[PDB]
Amino acid sequence: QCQDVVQDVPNVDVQMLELYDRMSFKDIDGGVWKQGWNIKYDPLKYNAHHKLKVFVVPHSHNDPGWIQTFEEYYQHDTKHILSNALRHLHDNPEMKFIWAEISYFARFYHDLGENKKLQMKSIVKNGQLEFVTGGWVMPDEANSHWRNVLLQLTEGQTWLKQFMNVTPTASWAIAPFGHSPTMPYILQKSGFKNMLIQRTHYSVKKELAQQRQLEFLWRQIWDNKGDTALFTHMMPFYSYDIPHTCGPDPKVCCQFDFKRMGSFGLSCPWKVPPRTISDQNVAARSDLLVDQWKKKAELYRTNVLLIPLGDDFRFKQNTEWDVQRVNYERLFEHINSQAHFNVQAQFGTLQEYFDAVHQAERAGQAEFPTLSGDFFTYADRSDNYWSGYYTSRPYHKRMDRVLMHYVRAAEMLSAWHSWDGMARIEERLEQARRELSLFQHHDGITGTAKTHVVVDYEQRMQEALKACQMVMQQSVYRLLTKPSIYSPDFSFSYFTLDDSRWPGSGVEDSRTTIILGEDILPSKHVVMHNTLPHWREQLVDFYVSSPFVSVTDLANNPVEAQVSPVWSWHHDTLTKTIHPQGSTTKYRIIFKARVPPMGLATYVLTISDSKPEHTSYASNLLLRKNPTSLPLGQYPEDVKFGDPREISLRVGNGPTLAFSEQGLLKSIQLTQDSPHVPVHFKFLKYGVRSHGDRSGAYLFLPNGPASPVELGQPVVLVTKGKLESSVSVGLPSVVHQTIMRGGAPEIRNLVDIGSLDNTEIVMRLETHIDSGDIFYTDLNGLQFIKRRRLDKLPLQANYYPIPSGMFIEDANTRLTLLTGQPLGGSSLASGELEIMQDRRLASDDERGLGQGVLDNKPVLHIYRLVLEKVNNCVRPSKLHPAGYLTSAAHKASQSLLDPLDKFIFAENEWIGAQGQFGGDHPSAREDLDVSVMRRLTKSSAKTQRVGYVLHRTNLMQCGTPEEHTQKLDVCHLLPNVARCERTTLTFLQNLEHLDGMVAPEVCPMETAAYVSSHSS
Ligand SMILES: [Zn+2]
Which residues make up the binding site for Zn(2+)? Predict the structure, then answer.
């Protein structure tokens, strides 16, 4: 019986939106705890019968790229940290250490000799070395898509299970810049029992600490019953470094970072150095330290205290291991033997801490509050809100989403078969998963790494895209060739991928033209793949070398097509205008492909000597003063010219869109009769402050509200076709395109911020929707959370991640903007939405990156814009912290994130070609997705296993009967099923053996994983 995620407002002790509405956020000087208060404790709280149990947990934060690349850090730091951890833990049985980043650990362990592997396995098995989280990385939580958070978690944990025989159940996330409830969502469905977070707004830490609500059961915002809850520990202070982890006074705690005495090149900024512990000072030093611990303990409810002991790339040299270990051992020996402290302190691991906390809870010592909400937008001090990284390096943010889809499609397409090892399918998929997983790091997708590190991530992702293409095209060839003809060369490219939106028109000329001609090749097969588990139609386009091309399906049924020119925009450095040029030798052909669920469909493009019966030609109108001619080769319609003017377009029976004379949307009319609803796109710019703190890769510190971009008299290109029309305009730094295909328009911005230093370009929508101070943004592509604009916070605090969409609404009307890339955005006034396109910042923002953001490159951002009437929708009540998409907005998001894949057959003739794959696949209800399909076994396994992650979203009920679909049972998608299990989302633990080998569908907002096993 599925929980209702709409109509029941959960009762939680802390609801972060409500807390935000009540909190004052005053930034007062709290004393040595600058953002807190002077903590007081009663010395008599702890006594012989009630001691404070202190776990000092050594750690080393290892960034998989940040100011050096992964490999540079591995060579210069991490391999030494791990080698010396292995030696020192081996030699010191009571010493402990936690490790989070499995990308580094796997890199290290595979290079170890067998003797050392065995030693390493032993210190893990005996609990000295403990993995925390066990993902490939410690991912960003703002920009990352939940699918990639799960991918990287699975990549690390699958490695750990295979090589270390452990599966962490405690998560450690000390570094991401703000925290998302998507993490406890995924972790709780992946076996976890506990998680730790750190980077939350200093005001939130103060507020929760005052109420001893820093440990809480974190449930999802829609979860009325609480089954999603995951115990969460929030660290209370400003950093995870040693000065901010022993207690509230960093001037004292820094004295207990024994790497800071000088020979290591480190010191304490509070000007009191550590001193080596001796018999003559250990009582005074213990008094100071235990006092810090007892103050920290006042912020929490049990008598078990967590004291992290670590910092970035710590525990590298042997002398550092010694200096920390020996000094802490001297303190523990003293403290634990002095009854008056009533403390027992020891090195521990994270799991040991949580185990002891829950023993205290079970003993009735504490009850923990429940919490829902998120922890964005983080500020670590004053007005320094970390909303810049929601946009920084947007090229790679978009690339993340492209690769996300490519990985899913490559894993799904190749899962249908078992492949010989010679095919290198598993090799290529592992590479692709690992490079995408690496980029989920909190300096990867966030855009907060040095320029050469961003290049390394991009190069890795490019190799991952090539790997996905290889696997996908080999799979299509196999799936659509008569078996007794199939004759693969696993190194050959049978197909090339054609992607219209990455890197994108104006970004890279990467797309192959299908070259047809009477004297070379009459026709070409193309194949579309649909990774979604429902039948799908989508227009697809290809470049062709003639306008006289017609399309057939493989029953030779004509398919209606539209040919349009190939337009490319040029920054004309002679005329100082931005204007489009059309090709005279290549053309776009567009047609509707209809593709089975999780399936493939083949079409044929054929040249003819003149206009074919079922192909139409778009008209083109270039609006500008001072036009010049625009020849288009054989294209049969001459370009028309006019002065700038307002224009209106309608494709099919879809909305009618009206545009200003600058080529920007001004209104949407949903139907013939209905009103022209004002919806106005505008581009604006934010600058940087000339006094005080400067924006950089992390921080957004605008110098006031944005100023409109001066547009001049831009050139507007209108293409009008039966299947697709568009309005494109060359604005300064953005070629802005509105594309209409009969439903909600697609927006594409080719953003080139050029050399505009200290500028952030924002795209705003202005409407007269009476949204007030409310808007909705998504978290990791998984859920939409209610936001409230707070004028008591500065502008940048009202920016939130827009990882896949945002909307505003009133009682009657909603405007949703779906994105194909994570970007930052807000609603800074009633009726507005805005989303940042790019930012170019000359200054460093003091968070360690040591550079601004001056490596911009053109990026094609894509969106869908859905205006809808919502007065008939069953929406959550006014107090509910969630919102939900409509069917149309969800499909529009899927059209961006998981479009059809397009394959062009590379050779002249495809012998044995088949017309379709997957026609018998069930077409599941529109809210269900097969987020992952992954064969889990190599071909030598007698029992093959295939893993599926199913995700059901929740779409609002708005009165559309919309029904009859088939049940999707993933366990029967492959034949000869012998067992069906429900598993954790990482596939690593079987949770239920399923009757009848039937994988039941999941409830709204739930995600489940199943593994089918097959005997043949
Ligand atoms: Zn980090």
Answer: 61, 63, 175, 442
